[PDB]
Specification:
The structure is cut from a larger assembly and holds chains A, B, C and D.
Chain A (H helix, E strand, L loop, with lengths): L14 H9 L7 H9 L1
Chain B lengths: L1 H9 L4 H14 L4 H17 L4 H8 L1 H4 L4 H15 L2 H10 L1 H6 L2 H12 L1 H12 L21 H6 L1
Chain D lengths: L7 E2 H7 L7 H11 L12 E2 L10 H32 L1
Antiparallel strand pairs in D: 1-2
Classes of the chains: A mainly alpha, B mainly alpha, C mainly alpha, D mainly alpha.
PDB class: hydrolase/inhibitor
Keywords: protein degradation, complex, MG-132, HYDROLASE-INHIBITOR complex
Entry title: Human 19S-20S proteasome, state SD2
């Protein structure tokens, strides 16, 4: 009973959600975060 | 003595460890004068660790231990008195008074940890203080007054 | 799985893949603490006879392994940074370098929070890095992830606690298993029912 | 001290206990050494909440009230017939 109809319209995953969360972030790489505390 | 050190380290039995240390001190007497005091300190530590601090003073009083009696003997005596008094401050004062004796043995540090757990009943009365009269914190500033760094001993217990 | 299969610390022999038994230990301590609960960590690594000599050689590994158990939050955060550089440089540990550091940070944040229902962010700063804002931003992001099981507050500047699983999440635990369990029967009945 | 009262003042309870309020915590430590129980007192509000110590499920409270209220009702009905019979005695 294949629908068809709509064609017209870990190893590489699991961590993808975690990676997506800080993909924009982590520019500091943690070591800079420690340096920021040192300046504080 | 080595049988005593390994038996003492296991902590399963300290009574056997004392017996080996005394046998080592008895052998060390005369033949090895420097070695005997180290066994003497350990046999006294075993008595404090065995929860019978009163015997520590009696052993130093005995003629066999009189020859090596000294400041080292006094440090063990005050620590035994502190455990009998069940006062952490007394144990701390003894630790502060004799720095040299403190360096060799850290098992006494474990006894202070049992002593903070001994004051848990006072914390239960301090925790019971709201049931009675809550004052200051009842978990930190109130317990035994003292330092506010008492918190973290409770936190380590809470985990 | 590796932390469980690295139980053979006693007999690694001198495997060629291990640069040294010392390297195998550095990996086993690094891998185990991320996946090991505090009861296992004291029983297997903190009280581990063989591991203790090997950590005697490495001061940094000893301080990092000991600090989490000792609840020395300030020392471990600095030590974790040293671990990050080593993890990125290391082959076979670089791909998950980010996951390891953040997962450790989540585990660290859960440990101090478990003891106190109410924690001033100033207190967290004293325990960890001095800046209040940096602990706050990590707290918000981890809280958002569902990690850190707690609710933050502002102006009051106190972090509260979340409901216990036994207390009421037991109902949630039955429902979560139940939703998948019930969903299966709905699909199954139709196939025979036709 | 027990009693059925709820918001009686703890400072007043210390006065009733005939001990100084300033040393009351030590004086109430004597209650702790007696270890009679913990009926409950809220010092923060300075009130001894001496009504119930440690709340269990109130299963008996409904059961006992239901058993008694029903039993009183049959007892009322059983006595009711005799009195109704007495009016009928003159009727």
């Amino acid at each position: 009973m294949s629908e068809k109809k709509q064609p017209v319209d870990e190893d590489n995953w699991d961590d993808d959600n975690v990676e997506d969360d800080f993909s924009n972030q982590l520019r500091a790489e943690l070591e800079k975060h420690g340096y920021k505390m040192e300046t504080s | 003595m080595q049988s005593g050190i390994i038996h003492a380290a296991e902590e399963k039995d300290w009574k056997t460890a004392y017996s080996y240390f005394y046998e080592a001190f008895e052998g060390y007497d005369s033949i090895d004068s420097p070695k005997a005091i180290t066994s003497l300190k350990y046999m006294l530590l075993c008595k404090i660790m065995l929860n019978t601090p009163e015997d520590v003073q009696a052993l130093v009083s005995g003629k066999l231990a009189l020859r090596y009696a000294g400041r080292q003997t006094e440090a063990l005596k005050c620590v035994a008195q502190a455990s009998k008094n069940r006062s952490l401050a007394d144990f701390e004062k003894a630790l502060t008074d004799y720095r040299a004796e403190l360096r060799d043995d850290p098992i006494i540090s474990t006894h202070l940890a049992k002593l903070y757990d001994n004051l848990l009943e006072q914390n239960l009365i301090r925790v019971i203080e709201p049931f009675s009269r809550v004052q200051i914190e009842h978990i930190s500033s109130l317990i035994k007054l003292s330092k506010a760094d008492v918190e973290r001993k409770l936190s380590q217990m809470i985990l | 799985q590796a932390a469980e299969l690295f139980l053979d610390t006693v007999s690694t022999f001198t495997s060629y893949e291990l640069m040294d038994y010392k390297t195998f230990v550095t990996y086993t301590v690094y891998v185990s603490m991320i996946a090991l609960e505090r009861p296992d960590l004291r029983e297997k690594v903190i009280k581990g006879a063989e591991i203790l000599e090997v950590l005697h050689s490495l001061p940094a590994v000893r301080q990092y392994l000991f600090s989490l158990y000792e609840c020395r939050y300030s020392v471990f955060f600095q030590s974790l940074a040293v671990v990050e550089q080593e993890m990125k440089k290391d082959w076979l540990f670089a791909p998950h370098y980010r996951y390891y550091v953040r997962e450790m940070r989540i585990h660290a944040y859960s440990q101090l929070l478990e003891s106190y229902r109410s924690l001033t962010l100033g207190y967290m700063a004293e325990a960890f890095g001095v800046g209040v804002e940096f602990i706050d931003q990590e707290l918000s992001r981890f809280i958002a992830a569902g990690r850190l099981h707690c609710k933050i507050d502002k102006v009051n500047e106190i972090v509260e606690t979340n409901r216990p699983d036994s207390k009421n999440w037991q109902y949630q635990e039955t429902i979560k298993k139940g939703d998948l369990l019930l969903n299966r029967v709905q699909k199954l009945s139709r196939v025979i029912n036709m | 001290m027990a009693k059925y009262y709820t918001r009686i003042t703890m400072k007043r309870m210390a006065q009733l206990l005939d001990l100084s309020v300033d040393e009351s915590e030590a004086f109430l430590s004597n209650l702790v050494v007696n270890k009679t129980i913990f009926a409950k007192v809220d010092r923060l509000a300075g009130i001894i909440n001496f009504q119930r110590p440690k709340d269990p499920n109130n299963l008996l409270n409904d059961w006992s009230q239901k058993l008694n209220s029903l039993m009183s009702l049959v007892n009322k009905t059983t006595h009711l017939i005799a009195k109704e019979e007495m009016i009928h005695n003159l009727q």
